[PDB]
Design a binder for this molecule. Structure first.
Ligand SMILES: Nc1ncnc2c1ncn2[C@@H]1O[C@H](COP(=O)(O)OP(=O)(O)OP(=O)(O)O)[C@@H](O)[C@H]1O
Ligand SMILES: Nc1ncnc2c1ncn2[C@@H]1O[C@H](COP(=O)(O)OP(=O)(O)OP(=O)(O)O)[C@@H](O)[C@H]1O
Ligand SMILES: Nc1ncnc2c1ncn2[C@@H]1O[C@H](COP(=O)(O)OP(=O)(O)OP(=O)(O)O)[C@@H](O)[C@H]1O
Ligand SMILES: Nc1ncnc2c1ncn2[C@@H]1O[C@H](COP(=O)(O)OP(=O)(O)OP(=O)(O)O)[C@@H](O)[C@H]1O
Ligand SMILES: Nc1ncnc2c1ncn2[C@@H]1O[C@H](COP(=O)(O)OP(=O)(O)OP(=O)(O)O)[C@@H](O)[C@H]1O
Lengths: 277, 277, 277, 277, 277, 277
């Protein structure tokens, strides 16, 4: 009908690129890979969940893991907006979802994920609209970062509600090192040492840090002096040239955690209290 | 027309699945079935309650019963959407509800049920339009959990406004014992003491917590059997386990059931005063 | 064409089924019939009434008086919707709100009544359109429940603004005893003390209350006669057992008013202040 | 055609029936008739005002003078709708608003007036269409009570912005006495006490007030004579009786004018604030 | 065929009766006639201005200017509206336009102008159909007073977008004297003290002001004290009578500008910013 | 069908011709030279980027740098806009999108340069196809001028999104001297003091400035006092007359951009933050 925006969300790296949450990845592999192999278990009592609840700080791989599983997804995924923004003239944007579940059955093994459901009156209209259609073999999920704003029933509805804590300095060592895979770099780098200053970072913080040094190294030497737009040998030796703490040092001063840690403490106190598995 | 879109409203289990509510259960057993069976006395002042009110937290088997009635019902249901869409082409679907009730007399015995229908302009427009459509014999009902949002005249118009608290240890006894049916389950278990440890939960809590033990089967098994394709021990034996007190024991600390029921307490204060039977 | 929708809008008991409204029943008996029995006096300077104002709580005999006058009147009623639908092909039914009056002319004296006329642009458009078509002998009236929401010119335009007091003890008395018609009962019943019990209520309260004792005619019995098919001796003795004060004990403990007195009391403040008679 | 529907826009009591507004009635007497009697003075810069701007609390003799002048009107008025359908079939009902003035001049030096035409796309399409259509001798007019409805061009288009406040007291004297016309009445009246105690009201208030004591003439007499058809000596002597101050005591206490001067006062500023003479 | 509607769009006084916009008056002697007299200058860079844009506070002689223009313009004018009211029978209008620029070059380098061109898909239909037909050398222009609805593409293609504020007191003074033409008038006059009260007043206000003292002349006589409707010789003394500062005094105190300034201020800001010259 | 028409999309110029954004000259030495010469530095994280688009004014050499890169590029180029105005005869310019990728891989290292990016439903058939395909170092680029032209996430999809500054000065002098070609004018002209105070301007602005002084040719002389309908040899020597520096004086100071530079600052911050390089 008006499926421009509906057909728009028609949709088409590796899995354990991400490192952490043995319980989560476990329960998901279990929840997803197995019933294809073993439908006979997953039945009524035994049958799997098609979603849960989640939350975490932004830039913490919740959108990247979506690509990790879309990459895993030998099944089908359906893409997402937080904005089914009709007009006062159009006024109806959850019959959209009444066609969505037709897509879900159409691509019968079907996958969906959003962030920040917490996205007035028509809010209650469509937000309420999703609930009856919420309940053939399908998965979906969603997440936020302010489950303190857990509004109505999703402490009831959903079997698990994960707040993620940031990786520890040990992890962050292993995760820089997972981020530094295949990098020109001097051997002065003790990742345990530099990670002393990373405390408070997310994944992406460390990402754009290692990048910030990756282009520090570009901008160290006569980098303004082009060859007039041509190749010099040393310019190719940039790949040959290494990254260093001093090439991080600009990245060290440059990058900051720059976030509300007390928010994580708040929604972590939440994640124990009405915060499901 | 949207007439076939009105034909989108076209419809086409057991009772002891449900536990509790024996007053309501006989009230509805009676008020629904027996008018079929004694038209000679279900009449006049003895008219069938064509609707009444409802309340309580959701995920309380209201949708579950709402399906159980359907597979139970010897009448003509009609599929229901609160998303009677809002085009700037007709801008009127409570008219199409005039066509609905037309179907209701066409399918002279019939059933409908929606929920959370506390659902500016369009609200009073199409709602009050329906109220014009409000008043052979037919039954419909609806529900919500916000009698806080007891909008204008709904509470006054219905026979009984039914709040439900959480179940008790004996309700929870039979509810556990219903979830556990046909299950590989050990016999060392005091499901009544387990139910004693169910302080202030839902039915669905019992459901997905029995499931939490159901996965705890795997968690006790060699859950690292991620050989994949290679069937092995895991494929050979998922029926082997019998669930045990320890499965549920971990399942308990796994729980963060839901938020506080202080709003359920609130409308429970409403369910007495201004809340009918 | 869509005028045929008004051809669908064509329309084609006793006052002693009702209690009170002495002023109103007077003024309507009078203002309608007696000019129709005395065209000669009640005309010109003695112009008979064609409309006035109304409002109050619902379930207050507005529907009851509606269908009551329907089966009563010796004149030409026409059915009443709020569905002058809104096509974005024509989007103009106020012409049919003129052919309205053509029907008032073709049926020279006519009867119409709506309620809850809260019924953007198009609202004001067709509204003022009716203010044009508004202004031989005809009477029509309307009502709402929000004279607080008496929109712009309605209060000014009508003679009689109406406030419906809730019933008093003797109102309650005859309202019961009329509600207790066709009612094999016990004679312990003290309708006076019962009327004492039942303050803060309306007529529909007595309706559903008498019905509550009505189902209690069963539920006094061994209520679970689920033999089924077996014509239980109750099924012959249905009307046999009597109404008893126990049945209204169980009922009236089951009853809530579902009444917010402060709103009807609010427009009761209005019913003197900008509230005509 | 719809052009033939314009044939439905076709038209075919006096001033001193009305009281007050010596200023207005002067300007109208003058601006209408004296050009029609003196083409020689009234021309060029002495051109007659073919329309201007009007206000007042509605139902205060605006449509009433609109009729009374039509009885006076010794020229060619034709009837006036705000109802040209929003047909998505012919592109513009404003086409007939173009043939409008062809009908005017082809017919005669002509007369037009509407009320409450404060009156989306098609709205301003046809509106501006008339704004061109307006710009020999012809007269037109229009009114409202919407002070904010000087939408785009309206303040500029109409020369003088006319408003009528609520009456003063000697007004209420002469307006009683005009409302006391054709009235057998007791000479005990203190019209000064009447206009005094009846202050701040509309004309229509007084209309229904005289009708109120009028019906009161019965409501003292044997209203209870519900024989029906059986004549009463009053039923012949209905007009025989005179009305009394005691009757208008009832007619006082029974009513609230059902209007606040809030927006009446707002336009009582707008009549000065961007309100021409 | 129906294109004769454009044969009906055909059309066939002084020019310089205006005080203001002297730079524009230059521009419109200059892009206009001297092309018709010296194309040798006007071609290439020198070529005449193809078109531009206009707006301002309504009724400031802007809709009246074009009568002066075409009354003076020896070149050819054809009328304009927004009257492309097509039919679904036609399913199209802008074949008109293809025949319309052909109409232009068919007769001669011609004259065209609309007001309120701020005027579903049909807008895109006739607009996209137009804007190539937009482009032997000819001039056209348009105007509005709603630059809030101003375009980008026509803000793009157009050379200029002209605003006028209200006049100034000396222009206003010589516009009294322009409005005091053919006018019996006294010698106690102070045209700049007259113009002192022009706060908020534009030209048309002064037009109706001279007409307001003009009517004031009779308003000093007694009108409804008829001469039997006779042409009283005092009515020729009106031709003898002169108008006076006192005669305007009443109009000045009695009259508002009937307008709002800050919208003219709004587009006076847009005329500088994103409004071309 | 459109294969030979597509053979016109084929394409192939000094690059410091376009001046400023030398950081971007590094970007394009790193997007043209090095992804063709040395993608070994540009590996993994440093890997070549996919494509982007551009905010900025026009008159900014978007196609200048495009063709300059093109004939400079060891990669190929294509002549592309959004003006694939498809037909029923063509049927699918989305097959022309697929053919665009096909030619891109055919001339495997290639460049494509497009704007009119937001230039009906066909926009979304093609846009969706292109969005799906985009996934080698076959670099591509688009552009626009609307900063809010981020469609839904296609801005979010891109490598980067850049706003660009105003131009340098010696080409403002030189291109003054390009548009002033073949013009009568003085030799005193300080084209770098012309180009000095050009702050915030573009090309056609200054073309209209050339026309502006070219009419100042007259508007020093008197347009009102003609030669009496004659064409005095001065009136034709205006063609012979010299335009000069101070002939632009009012054309310099009074002429404004009429554009928003602080939204340019907004989206400039958007390419500083939340917009990549
Ligand atoms: N555990 C991890 N292992 C490796 N990389 C990680 C991990 N967590 C985060 N990252 C890196 O940080 C980036 C953050 O991506 P992503 O946007 O998915 O986080 P996010 O929380 O979903 O952000 P947002 O919630 O704002 O969308 C990832 O692309 C990834 O490269
Ligand atoms: N008394 C009960 N008997 C059986 N099952 C129950 C009971 N209470 C809750 N449940 C279980 O809880 C789950 C959710 O119940 P259900 O959705 O029907 O309640 P609800 O009020 O309709 O919730 P919602 O309206 O939010 O969907 C069901 O799977 C149901 O089996
Ligand atoms: N004066 C009365 N006499 C008899 N019955 C009454 C009276 N007033 C109220 N009732 C009872 O109240 C019940 C509901 O009244 P009714 O529906 O007519 O009021 P209402 O304003 O039309 O309500 P709604 O508009 O919400 O349907 C009826 O069954 C009627 O018997
Ligand atoms: N001075 C007066 N003389 C006579 N009648 C008056 C006077 N002032 C007010 N009225 C009364 O006002 C009443 C209604 O006025 P009218 O209907 O003309 O106004 P309206 O605003 O056009 O009404 P509506 O808003 O319903 O269209 C008339 O019955 C009339 O008698
Ligand atoms: N400077 C002026 N010189 C001459 N006449 C003027 C001047 N200013 C205003 N007027 C008068 O104002 C009247 C209304 O102006 P006009 O309708 O032409 O302008 P407009 O703003 O286009 O009006 P609209 O946009 O509402 O059609 C004209 O009759 C004109 O005589």
């Amino acid at each position: 009908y008006i499926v421009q925006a509906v057909r728009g969300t028609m949709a088409t790296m590796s899995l354990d690129d991400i490192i952490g949450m043995h319980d989560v990845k476990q329960v998901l592999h279990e929840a997803v890979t197995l019933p294809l192999l073993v439908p006979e278990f997953f039945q009524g009592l035994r049958s799997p969940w098609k979603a849960m609840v989640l939350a975490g700080p932004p830039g913490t791989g919740k959108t990247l893991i979506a690509r990790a599983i879309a990459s895993e997804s030998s099944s089908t995924f359906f893409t997402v907006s937080s904005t089914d923004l009709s007009s006062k003239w159009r006024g109806d944007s959850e019959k959209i979802v009444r066609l969505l579940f037709e897509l879900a059955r159409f691509y019968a093994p079907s996958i969906i994920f959003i962030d920040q459901i917490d996205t007035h009156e028509a809010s209650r209209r469509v937000k309420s609209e999703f609930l009856v259609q919420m309940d053939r073999r399908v998965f979906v999920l969603a997440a936020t970062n302010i489950p303190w704003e857990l509004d109505e029933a999703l402490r009831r509805r959903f079997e698990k509600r994960i707040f993620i804590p940031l990786p520890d300095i040990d992890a962050r060592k292993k995760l820089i090192e997972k981020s530094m895979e295949g990098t020109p770099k001097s051997d002065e780098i003790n990742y345990d040492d530099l990670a002393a200053r990373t405390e408070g970072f997310s994944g992406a913080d460390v990402v754009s840090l290692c990048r910030t040094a990756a282009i520090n190294v570009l901008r160290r030497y006569d980098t303004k002096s082009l060859r007039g737009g041509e190749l010099t040998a040393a310019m190719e030796s940039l790949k040959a040239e290494l990254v260093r703490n001093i090439d991080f040092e600009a990245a060290l001063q440059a990058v900051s955690p720059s976030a509300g840690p007390d928010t994580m403490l708040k929604c972590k106190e939440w994640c124990d209290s009405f915060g499901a598995m």
